[PDB]
PDB file of C-alpha atoms and ligand atoms in Angstrom:
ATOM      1  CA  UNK A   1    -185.641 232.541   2.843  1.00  0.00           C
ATOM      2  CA  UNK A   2    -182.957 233.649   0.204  1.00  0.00           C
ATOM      3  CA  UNK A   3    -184.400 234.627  -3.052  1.00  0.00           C
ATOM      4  CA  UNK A   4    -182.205 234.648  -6.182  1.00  0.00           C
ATOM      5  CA  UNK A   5    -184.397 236.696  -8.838  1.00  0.00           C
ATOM      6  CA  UNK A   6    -182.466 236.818 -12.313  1.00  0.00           C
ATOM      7  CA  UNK A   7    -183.151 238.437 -15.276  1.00  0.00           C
ATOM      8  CA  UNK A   8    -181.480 239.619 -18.531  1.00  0.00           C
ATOM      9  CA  UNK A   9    -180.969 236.704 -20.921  1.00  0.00           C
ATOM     10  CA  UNK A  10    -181.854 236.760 -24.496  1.00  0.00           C
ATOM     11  CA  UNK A  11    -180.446 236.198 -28.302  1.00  0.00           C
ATOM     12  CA  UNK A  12    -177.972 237.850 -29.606  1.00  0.00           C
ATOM     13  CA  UNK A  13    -175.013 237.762 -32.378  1.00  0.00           C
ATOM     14  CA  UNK A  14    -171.645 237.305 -32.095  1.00  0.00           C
ATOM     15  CA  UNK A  15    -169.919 240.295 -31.153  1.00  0.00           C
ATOM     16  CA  UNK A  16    -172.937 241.946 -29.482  1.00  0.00           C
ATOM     17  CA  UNK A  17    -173.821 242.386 -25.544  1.00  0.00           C
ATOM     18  CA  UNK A  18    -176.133 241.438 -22.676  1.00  0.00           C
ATOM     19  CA  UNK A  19    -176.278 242.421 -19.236  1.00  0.00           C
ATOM     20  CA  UNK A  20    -177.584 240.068 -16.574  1.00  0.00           C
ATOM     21  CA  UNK A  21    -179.291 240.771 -13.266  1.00  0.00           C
ATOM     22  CA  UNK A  22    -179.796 238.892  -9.897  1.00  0.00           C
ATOM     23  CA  UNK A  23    -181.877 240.738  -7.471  1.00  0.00           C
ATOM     24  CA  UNK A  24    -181.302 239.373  -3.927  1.00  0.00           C
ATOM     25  CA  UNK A  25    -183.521 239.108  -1.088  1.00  0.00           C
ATOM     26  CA  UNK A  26    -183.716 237.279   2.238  1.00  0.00           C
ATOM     27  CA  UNK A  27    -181.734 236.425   4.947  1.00  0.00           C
ATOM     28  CA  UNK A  28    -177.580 236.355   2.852  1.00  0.00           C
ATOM     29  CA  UNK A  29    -175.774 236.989   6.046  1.00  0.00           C
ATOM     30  CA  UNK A  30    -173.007 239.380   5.721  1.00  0.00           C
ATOM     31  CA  UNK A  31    -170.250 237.892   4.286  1.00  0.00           C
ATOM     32  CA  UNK A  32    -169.738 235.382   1.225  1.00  0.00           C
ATOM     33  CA  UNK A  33    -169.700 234.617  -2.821  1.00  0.00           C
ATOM     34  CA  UNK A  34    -172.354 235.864  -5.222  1.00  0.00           C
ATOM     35  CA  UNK A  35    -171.475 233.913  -8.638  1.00  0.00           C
ATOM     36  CA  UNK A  36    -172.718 233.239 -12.292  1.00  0.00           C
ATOM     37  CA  UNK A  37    -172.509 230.118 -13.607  1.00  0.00           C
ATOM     38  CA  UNK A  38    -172.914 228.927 -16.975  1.00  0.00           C
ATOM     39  CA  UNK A  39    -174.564 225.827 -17.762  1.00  0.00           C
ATOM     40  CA  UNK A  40    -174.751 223.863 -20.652  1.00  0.00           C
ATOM     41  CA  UNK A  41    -174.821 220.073 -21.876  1.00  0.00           C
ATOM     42  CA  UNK A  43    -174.629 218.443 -16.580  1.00  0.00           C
ATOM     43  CA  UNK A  44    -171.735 220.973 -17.193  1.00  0.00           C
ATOM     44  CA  UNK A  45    -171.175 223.891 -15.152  1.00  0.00           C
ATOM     45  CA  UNK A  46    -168.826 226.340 -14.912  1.00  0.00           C
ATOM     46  CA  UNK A  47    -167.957 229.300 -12.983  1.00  0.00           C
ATOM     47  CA  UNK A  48    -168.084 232.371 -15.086  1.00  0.00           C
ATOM     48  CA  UNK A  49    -167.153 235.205 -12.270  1.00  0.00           C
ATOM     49  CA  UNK A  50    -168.107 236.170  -8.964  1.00  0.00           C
ATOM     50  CA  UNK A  51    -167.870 238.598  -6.205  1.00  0.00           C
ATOM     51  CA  UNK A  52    -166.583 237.670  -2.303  1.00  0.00           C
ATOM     52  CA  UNK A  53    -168.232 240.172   0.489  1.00  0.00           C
ATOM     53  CA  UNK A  54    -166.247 240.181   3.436  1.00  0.00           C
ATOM     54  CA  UNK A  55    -167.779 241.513   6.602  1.00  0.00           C
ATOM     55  CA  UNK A  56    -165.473 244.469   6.481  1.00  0.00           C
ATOM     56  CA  UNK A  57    -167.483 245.900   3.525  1.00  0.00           C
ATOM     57  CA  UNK A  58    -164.682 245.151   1.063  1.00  0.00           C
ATOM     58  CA  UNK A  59    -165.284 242.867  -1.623  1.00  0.00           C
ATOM     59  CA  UNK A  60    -163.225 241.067  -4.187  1.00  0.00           C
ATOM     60  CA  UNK A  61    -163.800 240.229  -8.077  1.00  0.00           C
ATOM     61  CA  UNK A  62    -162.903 236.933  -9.712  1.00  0.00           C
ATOM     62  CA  UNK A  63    -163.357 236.204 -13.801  1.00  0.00           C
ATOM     63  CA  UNK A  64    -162.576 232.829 -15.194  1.00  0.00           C
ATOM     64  CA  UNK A  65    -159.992 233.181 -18.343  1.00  0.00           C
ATOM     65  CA  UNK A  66    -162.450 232.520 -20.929  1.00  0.00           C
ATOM     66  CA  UNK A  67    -164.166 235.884 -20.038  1.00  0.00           C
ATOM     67  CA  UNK A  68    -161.736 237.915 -18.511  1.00  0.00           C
ATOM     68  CA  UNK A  69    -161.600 241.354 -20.496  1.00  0.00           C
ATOM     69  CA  UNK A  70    -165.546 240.726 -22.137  1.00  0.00           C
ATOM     70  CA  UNK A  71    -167.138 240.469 -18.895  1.00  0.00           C
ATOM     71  CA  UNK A  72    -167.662 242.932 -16.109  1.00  0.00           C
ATOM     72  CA  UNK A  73    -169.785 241.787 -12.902  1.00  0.00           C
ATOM     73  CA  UNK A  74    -170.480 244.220 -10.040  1.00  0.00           C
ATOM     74  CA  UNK A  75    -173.168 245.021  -7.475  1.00  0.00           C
ATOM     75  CA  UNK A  76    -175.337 247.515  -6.211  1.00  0.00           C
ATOM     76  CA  UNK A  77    -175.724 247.002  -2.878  1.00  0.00           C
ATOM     77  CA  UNK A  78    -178.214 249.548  -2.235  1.00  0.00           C
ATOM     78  CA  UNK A  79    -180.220 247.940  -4.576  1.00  0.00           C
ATOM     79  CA  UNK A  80    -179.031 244.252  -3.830  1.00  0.00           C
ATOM     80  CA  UNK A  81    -178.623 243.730  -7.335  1.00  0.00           C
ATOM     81  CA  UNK A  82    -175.419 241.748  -8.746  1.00  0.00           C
ATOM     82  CA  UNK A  83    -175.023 242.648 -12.753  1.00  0.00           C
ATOM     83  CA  UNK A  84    -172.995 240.419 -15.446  1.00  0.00           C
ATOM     84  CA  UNK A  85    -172.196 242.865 -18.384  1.00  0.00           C
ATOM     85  CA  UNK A  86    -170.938 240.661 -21.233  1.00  0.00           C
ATOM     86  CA  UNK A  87    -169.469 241.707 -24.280  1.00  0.00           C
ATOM     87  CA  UNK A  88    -167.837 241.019 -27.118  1.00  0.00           C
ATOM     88  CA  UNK A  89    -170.315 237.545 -26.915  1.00  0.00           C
ATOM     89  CA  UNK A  90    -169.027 234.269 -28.484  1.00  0.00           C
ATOM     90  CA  UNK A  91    -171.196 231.311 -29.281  1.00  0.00           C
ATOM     91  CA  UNK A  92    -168.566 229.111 -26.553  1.00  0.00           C
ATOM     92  CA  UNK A  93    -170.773 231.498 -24.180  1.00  0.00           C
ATOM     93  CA  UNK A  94    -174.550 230.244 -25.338  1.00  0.00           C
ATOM     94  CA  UNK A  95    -176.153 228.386 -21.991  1.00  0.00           C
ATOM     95  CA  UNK A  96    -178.409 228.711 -18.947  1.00  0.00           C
ATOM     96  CA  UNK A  97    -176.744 230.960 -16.297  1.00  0.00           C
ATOM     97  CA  UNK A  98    -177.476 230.792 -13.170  1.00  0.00           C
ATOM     98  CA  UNK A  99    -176.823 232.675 -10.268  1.00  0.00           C
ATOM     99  CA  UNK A 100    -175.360 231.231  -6.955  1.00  0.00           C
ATOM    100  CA  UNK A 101    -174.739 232.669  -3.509  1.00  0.00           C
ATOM    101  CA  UNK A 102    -173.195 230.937  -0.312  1.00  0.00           C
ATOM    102  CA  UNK A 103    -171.256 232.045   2.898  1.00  0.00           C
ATOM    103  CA  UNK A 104    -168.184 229.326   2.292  1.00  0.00           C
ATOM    104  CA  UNK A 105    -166.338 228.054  -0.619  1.00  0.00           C
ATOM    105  CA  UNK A 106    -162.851 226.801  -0.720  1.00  0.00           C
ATOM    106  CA  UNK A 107    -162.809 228.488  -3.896  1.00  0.00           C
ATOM    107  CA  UNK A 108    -165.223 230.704  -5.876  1.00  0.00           C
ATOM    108  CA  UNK A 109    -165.750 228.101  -9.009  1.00  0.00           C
ATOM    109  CA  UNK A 110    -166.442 225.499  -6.661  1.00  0.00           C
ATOM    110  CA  UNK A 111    -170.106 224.906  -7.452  1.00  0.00           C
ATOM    111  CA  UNK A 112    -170.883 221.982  -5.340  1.00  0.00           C
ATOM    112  CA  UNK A 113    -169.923 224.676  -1.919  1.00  0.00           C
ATOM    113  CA  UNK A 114    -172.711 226.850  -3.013  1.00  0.00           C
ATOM    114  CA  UNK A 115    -176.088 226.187  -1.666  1.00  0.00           C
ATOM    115  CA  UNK A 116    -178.507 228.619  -2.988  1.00  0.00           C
ATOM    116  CA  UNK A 117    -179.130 228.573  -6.539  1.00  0.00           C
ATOM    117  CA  UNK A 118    -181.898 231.270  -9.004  1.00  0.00           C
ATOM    118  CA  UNK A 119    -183.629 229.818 -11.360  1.00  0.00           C
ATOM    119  CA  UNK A 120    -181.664 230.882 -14.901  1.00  0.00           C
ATOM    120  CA  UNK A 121    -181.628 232.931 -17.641  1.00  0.00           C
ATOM    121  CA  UNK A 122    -181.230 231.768 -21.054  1.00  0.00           C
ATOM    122  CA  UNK A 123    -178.302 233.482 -23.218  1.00  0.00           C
ATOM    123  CA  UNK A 124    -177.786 232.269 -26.959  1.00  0.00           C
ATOM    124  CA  UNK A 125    -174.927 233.205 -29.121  1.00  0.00           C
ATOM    125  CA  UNK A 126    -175.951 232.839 -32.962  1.00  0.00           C
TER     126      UNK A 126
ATOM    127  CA  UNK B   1    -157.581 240.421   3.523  1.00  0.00           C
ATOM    128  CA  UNK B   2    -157.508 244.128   2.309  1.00  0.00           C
ATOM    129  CA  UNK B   3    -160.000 246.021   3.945  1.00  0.00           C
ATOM    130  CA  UNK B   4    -160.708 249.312   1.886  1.00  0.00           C
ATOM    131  CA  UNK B   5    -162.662 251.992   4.854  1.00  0.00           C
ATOM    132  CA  UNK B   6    -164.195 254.788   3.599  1.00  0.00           C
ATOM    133  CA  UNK B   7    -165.442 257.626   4.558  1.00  0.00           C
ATOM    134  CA  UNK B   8    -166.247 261.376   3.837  1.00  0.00           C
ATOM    135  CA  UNK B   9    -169.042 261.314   1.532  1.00  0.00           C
ATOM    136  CA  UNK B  10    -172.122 263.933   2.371  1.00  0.00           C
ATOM    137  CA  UNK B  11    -174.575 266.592   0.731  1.00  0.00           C
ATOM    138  CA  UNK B  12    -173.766 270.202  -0.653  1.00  0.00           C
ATOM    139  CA  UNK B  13    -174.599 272.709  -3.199  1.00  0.00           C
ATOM    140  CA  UNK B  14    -172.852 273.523  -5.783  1.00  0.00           C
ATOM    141  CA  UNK B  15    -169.843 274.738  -5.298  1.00  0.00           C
ATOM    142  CA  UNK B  16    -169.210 273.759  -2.622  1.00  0.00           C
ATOM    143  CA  UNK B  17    -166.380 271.188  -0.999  1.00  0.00           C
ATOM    144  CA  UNK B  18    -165.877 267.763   0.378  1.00  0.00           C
ATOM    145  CA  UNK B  19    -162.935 265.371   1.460  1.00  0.00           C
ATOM    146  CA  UNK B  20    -163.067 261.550   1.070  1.00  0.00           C
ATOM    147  CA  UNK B  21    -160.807 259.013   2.631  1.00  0.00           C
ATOM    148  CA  UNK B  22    -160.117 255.811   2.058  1.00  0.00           C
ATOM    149  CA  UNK B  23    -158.140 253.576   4.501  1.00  0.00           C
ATOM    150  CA  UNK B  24    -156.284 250.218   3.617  1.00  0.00           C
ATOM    151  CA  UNK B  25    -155.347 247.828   5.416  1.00  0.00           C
ATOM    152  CA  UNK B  26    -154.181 244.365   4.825  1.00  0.00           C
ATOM    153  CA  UNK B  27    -151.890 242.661   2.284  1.00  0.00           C
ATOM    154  CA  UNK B  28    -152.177 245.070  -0.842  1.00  0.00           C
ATOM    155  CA  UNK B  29    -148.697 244.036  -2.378  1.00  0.00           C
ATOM    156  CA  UNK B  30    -146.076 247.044  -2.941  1.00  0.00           C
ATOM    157  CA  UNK B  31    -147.464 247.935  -6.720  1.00  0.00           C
ATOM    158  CA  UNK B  32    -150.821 249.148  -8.184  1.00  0.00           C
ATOM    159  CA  UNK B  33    -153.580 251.409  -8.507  1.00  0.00           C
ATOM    160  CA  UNK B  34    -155.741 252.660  -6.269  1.00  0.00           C
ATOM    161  CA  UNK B  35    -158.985 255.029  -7.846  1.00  0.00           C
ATOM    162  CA  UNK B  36    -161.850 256.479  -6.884  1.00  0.00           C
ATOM    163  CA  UNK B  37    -164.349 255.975  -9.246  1.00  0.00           C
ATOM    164  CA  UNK B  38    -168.121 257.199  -9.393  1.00  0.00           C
ATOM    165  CA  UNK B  39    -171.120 254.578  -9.053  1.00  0.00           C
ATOM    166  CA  UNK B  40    -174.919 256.546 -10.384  1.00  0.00           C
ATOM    167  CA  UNK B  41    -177.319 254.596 -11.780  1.00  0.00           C
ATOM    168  CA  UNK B  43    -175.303 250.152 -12.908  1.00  0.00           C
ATOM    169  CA  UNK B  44    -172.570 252.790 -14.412  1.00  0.00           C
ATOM    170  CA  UNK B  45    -169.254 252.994 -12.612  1.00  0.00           C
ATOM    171  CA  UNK B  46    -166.639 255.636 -13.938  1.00  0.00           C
ATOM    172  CA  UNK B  47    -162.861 256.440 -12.662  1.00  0.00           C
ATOM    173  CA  UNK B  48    -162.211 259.747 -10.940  1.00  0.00           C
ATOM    174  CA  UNK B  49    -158.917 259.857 -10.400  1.00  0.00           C
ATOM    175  CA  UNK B  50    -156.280 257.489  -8.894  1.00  0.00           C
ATOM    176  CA  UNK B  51    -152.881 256.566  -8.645  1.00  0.00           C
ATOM    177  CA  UNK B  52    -150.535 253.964  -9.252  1.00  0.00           C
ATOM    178  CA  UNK B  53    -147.296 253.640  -6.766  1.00  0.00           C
ATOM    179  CA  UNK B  54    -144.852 251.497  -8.366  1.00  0.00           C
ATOM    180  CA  UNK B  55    -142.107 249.222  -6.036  1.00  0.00           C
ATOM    181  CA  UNK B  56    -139.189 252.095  -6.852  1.00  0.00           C
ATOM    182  CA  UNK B  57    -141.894 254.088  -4.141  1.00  0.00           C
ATOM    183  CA  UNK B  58    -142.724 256.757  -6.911  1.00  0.00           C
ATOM    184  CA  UNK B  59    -146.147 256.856  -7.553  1.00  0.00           C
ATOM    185  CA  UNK B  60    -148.197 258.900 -10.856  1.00  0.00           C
ATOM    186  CA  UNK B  61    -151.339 260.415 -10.137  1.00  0.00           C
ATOM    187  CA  UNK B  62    -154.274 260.344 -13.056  1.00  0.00           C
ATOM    188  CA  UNK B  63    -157.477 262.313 -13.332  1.00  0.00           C
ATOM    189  CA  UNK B  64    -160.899 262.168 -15.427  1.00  0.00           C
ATOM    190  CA  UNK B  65    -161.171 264.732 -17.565  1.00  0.00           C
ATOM    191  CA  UNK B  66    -164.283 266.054 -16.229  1.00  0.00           C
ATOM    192  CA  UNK B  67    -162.683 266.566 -12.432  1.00  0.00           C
ATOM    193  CA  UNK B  68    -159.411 267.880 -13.738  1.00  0.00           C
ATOM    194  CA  UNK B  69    -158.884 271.550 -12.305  1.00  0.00           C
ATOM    195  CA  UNK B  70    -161.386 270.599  -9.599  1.00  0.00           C
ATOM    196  CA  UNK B  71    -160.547 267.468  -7.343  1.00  0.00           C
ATOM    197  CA  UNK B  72    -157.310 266.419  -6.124  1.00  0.00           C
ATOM    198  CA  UNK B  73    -156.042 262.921  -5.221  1.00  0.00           C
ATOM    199  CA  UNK B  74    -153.325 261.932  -2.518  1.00  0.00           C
ATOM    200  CA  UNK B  75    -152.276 259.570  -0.378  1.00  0.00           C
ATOM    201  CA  UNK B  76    -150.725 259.534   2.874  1.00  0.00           C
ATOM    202  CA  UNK B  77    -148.840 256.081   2.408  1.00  0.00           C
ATOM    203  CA  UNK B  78    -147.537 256.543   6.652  1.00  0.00           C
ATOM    204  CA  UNK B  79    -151.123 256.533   7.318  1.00  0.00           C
ATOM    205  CA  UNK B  80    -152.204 254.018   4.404  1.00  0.00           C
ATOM    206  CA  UNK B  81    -154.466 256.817   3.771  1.00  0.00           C
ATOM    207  CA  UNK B  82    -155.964 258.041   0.280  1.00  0.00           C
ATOM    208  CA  UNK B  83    -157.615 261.193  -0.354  1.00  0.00           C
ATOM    209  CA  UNK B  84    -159.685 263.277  -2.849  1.00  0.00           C
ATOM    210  CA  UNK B  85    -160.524 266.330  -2.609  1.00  0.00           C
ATOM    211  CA  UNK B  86    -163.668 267.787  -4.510  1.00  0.00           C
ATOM    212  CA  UNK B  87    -163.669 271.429  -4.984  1.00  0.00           C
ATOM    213  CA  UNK B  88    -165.845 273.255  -6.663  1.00  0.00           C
ATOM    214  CA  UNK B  89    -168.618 270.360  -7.329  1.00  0.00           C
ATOM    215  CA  UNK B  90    -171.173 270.153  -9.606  1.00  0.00           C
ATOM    216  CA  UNK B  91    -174.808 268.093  -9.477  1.00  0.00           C
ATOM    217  CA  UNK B  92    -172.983 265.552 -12.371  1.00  0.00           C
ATOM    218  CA  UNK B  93    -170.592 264.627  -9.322  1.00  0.00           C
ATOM    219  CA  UNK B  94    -173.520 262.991  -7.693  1.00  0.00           C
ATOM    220  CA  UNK B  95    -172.798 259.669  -7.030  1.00  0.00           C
ATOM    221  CA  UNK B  96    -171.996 257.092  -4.690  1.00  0.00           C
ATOM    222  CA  UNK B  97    -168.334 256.958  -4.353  1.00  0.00           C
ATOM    223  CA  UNK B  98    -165.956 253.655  -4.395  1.00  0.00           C
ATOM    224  CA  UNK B  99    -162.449 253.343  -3.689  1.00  0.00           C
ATOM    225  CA  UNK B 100    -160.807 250.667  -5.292  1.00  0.00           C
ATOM    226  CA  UNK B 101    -157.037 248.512  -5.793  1.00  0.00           C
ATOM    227  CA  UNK B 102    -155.466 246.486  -7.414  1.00  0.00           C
ATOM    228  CA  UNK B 103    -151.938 245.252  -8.437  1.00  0.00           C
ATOM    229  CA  UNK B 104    -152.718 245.204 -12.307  1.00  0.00           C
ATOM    230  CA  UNK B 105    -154.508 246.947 -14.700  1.00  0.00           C
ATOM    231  CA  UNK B 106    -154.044 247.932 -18.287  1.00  0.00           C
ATOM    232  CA  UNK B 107    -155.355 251.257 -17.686  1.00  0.00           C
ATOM    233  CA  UNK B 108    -156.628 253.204 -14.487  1.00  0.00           C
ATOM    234  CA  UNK B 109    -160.161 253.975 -15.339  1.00  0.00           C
ATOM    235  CA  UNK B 110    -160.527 249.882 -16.436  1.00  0.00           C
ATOM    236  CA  UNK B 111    -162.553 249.397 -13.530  1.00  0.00           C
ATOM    237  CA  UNK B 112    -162.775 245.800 -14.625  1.00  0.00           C
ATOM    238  CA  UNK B 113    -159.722 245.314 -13.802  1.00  0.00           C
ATOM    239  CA  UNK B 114    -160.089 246.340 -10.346  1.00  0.00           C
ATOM    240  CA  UNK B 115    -159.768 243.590  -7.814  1.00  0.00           C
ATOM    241  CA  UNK B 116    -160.784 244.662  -4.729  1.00  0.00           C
ATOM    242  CA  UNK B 117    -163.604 247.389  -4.023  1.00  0.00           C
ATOM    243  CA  UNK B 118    -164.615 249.659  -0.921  1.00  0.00           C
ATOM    244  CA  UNK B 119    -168.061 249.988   0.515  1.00  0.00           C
ATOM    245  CA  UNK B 120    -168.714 253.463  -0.705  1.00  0.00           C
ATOM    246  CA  UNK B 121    -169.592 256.380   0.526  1.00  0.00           C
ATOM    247  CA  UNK B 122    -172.613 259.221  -0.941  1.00  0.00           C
ATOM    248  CA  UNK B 123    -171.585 262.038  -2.339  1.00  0.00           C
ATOM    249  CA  UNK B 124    -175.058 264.396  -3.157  1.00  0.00           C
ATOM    250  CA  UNK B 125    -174.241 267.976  -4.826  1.00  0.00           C
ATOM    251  CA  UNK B 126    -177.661 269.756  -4.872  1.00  0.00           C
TER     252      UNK B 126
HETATM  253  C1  LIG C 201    -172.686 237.661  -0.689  1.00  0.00           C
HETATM  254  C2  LIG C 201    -173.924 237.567   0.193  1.00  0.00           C
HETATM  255  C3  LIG C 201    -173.587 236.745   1.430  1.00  0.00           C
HETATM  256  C4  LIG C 201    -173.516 235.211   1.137  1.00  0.00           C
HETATM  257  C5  LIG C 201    -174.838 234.689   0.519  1.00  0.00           C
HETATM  258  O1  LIG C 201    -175.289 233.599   0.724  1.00  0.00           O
HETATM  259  C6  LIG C 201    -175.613 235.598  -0.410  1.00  0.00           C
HETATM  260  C7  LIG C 201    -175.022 236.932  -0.695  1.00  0.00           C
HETATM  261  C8  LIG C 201    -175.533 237.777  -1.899  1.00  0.00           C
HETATM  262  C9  LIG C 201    -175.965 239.244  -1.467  1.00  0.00           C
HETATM  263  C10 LIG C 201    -174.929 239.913  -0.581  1.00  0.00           C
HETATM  264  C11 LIG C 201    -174.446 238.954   0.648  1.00  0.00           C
HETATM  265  C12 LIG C 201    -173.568 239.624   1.630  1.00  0.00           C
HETATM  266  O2  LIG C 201    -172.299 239.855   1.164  1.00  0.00           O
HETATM  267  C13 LIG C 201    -174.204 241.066   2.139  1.00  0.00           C
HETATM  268  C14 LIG C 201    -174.631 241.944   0.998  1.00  0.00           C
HETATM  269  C15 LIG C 201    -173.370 242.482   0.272  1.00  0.00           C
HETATM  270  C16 LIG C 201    -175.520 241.184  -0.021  1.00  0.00           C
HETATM  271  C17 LIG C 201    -176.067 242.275  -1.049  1.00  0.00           C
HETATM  272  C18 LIG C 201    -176.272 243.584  -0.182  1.00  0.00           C
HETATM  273  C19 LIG C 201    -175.587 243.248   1.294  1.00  0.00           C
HETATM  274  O3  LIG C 201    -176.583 242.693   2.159  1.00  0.00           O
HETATM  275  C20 LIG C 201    -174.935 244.296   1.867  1.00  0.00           C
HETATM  276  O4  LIG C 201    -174.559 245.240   1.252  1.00  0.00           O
HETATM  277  C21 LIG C 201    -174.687 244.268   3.391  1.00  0.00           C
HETATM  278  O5  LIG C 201    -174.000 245.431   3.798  1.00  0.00           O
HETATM  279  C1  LIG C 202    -151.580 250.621  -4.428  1.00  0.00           C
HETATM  280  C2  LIG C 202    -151.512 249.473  -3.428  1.00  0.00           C
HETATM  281  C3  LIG C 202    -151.007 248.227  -4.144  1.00  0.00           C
HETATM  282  C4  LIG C 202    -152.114 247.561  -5.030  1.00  0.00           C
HETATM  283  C5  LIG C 202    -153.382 247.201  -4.215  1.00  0.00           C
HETATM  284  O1  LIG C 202    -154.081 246.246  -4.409  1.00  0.00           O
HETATM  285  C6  LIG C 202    -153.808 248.125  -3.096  1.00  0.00           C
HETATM  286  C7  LIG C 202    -152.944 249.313  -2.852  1.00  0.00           C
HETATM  287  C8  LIG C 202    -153.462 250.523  -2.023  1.00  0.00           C
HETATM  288  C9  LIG C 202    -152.461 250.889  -0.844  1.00  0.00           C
HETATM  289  C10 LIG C 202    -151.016 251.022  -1.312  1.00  0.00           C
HETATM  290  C11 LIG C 202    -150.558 249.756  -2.233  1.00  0.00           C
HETATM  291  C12 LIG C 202    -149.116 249.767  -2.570  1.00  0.00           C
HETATM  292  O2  LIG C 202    -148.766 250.719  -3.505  1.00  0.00           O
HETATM  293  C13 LIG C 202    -148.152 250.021  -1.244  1.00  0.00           C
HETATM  294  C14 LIG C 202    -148.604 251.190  -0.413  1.00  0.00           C
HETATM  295  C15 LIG C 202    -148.285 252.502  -1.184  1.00  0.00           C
HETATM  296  C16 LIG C 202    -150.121 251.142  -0.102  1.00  0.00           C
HETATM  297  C17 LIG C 202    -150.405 252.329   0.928  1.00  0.00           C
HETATM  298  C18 LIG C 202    -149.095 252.427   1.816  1.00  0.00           C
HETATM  299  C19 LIG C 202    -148.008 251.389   1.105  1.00  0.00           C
HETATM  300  O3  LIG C 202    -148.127 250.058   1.646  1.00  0.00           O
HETATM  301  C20 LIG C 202    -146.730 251.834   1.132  1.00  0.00           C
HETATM  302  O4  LIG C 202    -146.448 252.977   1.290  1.00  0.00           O
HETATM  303  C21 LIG C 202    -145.595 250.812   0.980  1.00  0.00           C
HETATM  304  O5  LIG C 202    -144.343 251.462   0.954  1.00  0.00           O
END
């Protein structure tokens, strides 16, 4: 039922930007993580994410190596989650993928999510 | 567990007036920022907010293009922040977010906003 529809990958050089989309769709629930991941050699890790609690409030999370380039948000009207990333290093080249599940013991914890998009590619000359 | 409520939002013409509120909630920590910023299109930029430090003083901050118009406040007995838009203009359009957060390097760095509200409309014909 979930659908994770991502878009927004490309080339780019170092120093440049990109801005990554994940339309949503389906039956979420109300309350839970919406993360990118970055995948590369199997190697995964979490990039950042948003929690949604049922109150309405949500919560941001960046992993160090992109804290300060990367901005991720959501337009909930739109049910669209956006990673804006800057400043782009060649560390940052892979497949990302974006994740959503109601539970995680911890945001980075890839192996709690269960729905996963099909990626976008982002290279980093 | 911070829960951000808000409320207020609604249509006008030019010129005219509204209120927001924002109510908090849960455990914010004694020190930060709390902002209003404006979501159109996404494109997310600060209002006006203010940052209460642990001494209980807190330093109010506004965008440039709000300054002379809108004025922030909070009722910290009634964990309560305000903004009041006078004198509003169709660029004021927007749906508008409340957010916190314990640290960030400056107020408008919405980036480095942790925790966001479920915003309310603001529509200024
Ligand atoms: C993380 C979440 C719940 C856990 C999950 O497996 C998938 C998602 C991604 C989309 C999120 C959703 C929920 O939070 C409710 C959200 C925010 C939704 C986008 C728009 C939304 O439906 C609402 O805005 C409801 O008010
Ligand atoms: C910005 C702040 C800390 C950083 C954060 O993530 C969320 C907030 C918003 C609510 C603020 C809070 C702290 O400043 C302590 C405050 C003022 C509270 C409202 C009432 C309060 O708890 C007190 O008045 C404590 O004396």
């Amino acid at each position: 039922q979930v659908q994770l529809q991502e878009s927004g990958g490309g080339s780019v050089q170092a120093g440049g930007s990109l801005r990554l989309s994940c339309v949503v769709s389906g039956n979420t629930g109300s309350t839970g993580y919406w993360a990118w991941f970055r995948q590369g050699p199997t190697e995964r890790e979490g990039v950042a994410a948003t929690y949604t609690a049922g109150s309405g409030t949500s919560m941001t999370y960046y992993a160090d190596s992109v804290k300060g380039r990367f901005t991720i948000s959501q337009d909930n009207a739109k049910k669209t989650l956006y990673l804006q990333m800057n400043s782009l290093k060649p560390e940052d080249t892979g497949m990302y993928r974006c994740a959503s599940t109601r539970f995680a013991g911890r945001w980075y914890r890839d192996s709690e999510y269960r729905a996963w998009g099909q990626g976008t590619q982002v290279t980093v000359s």
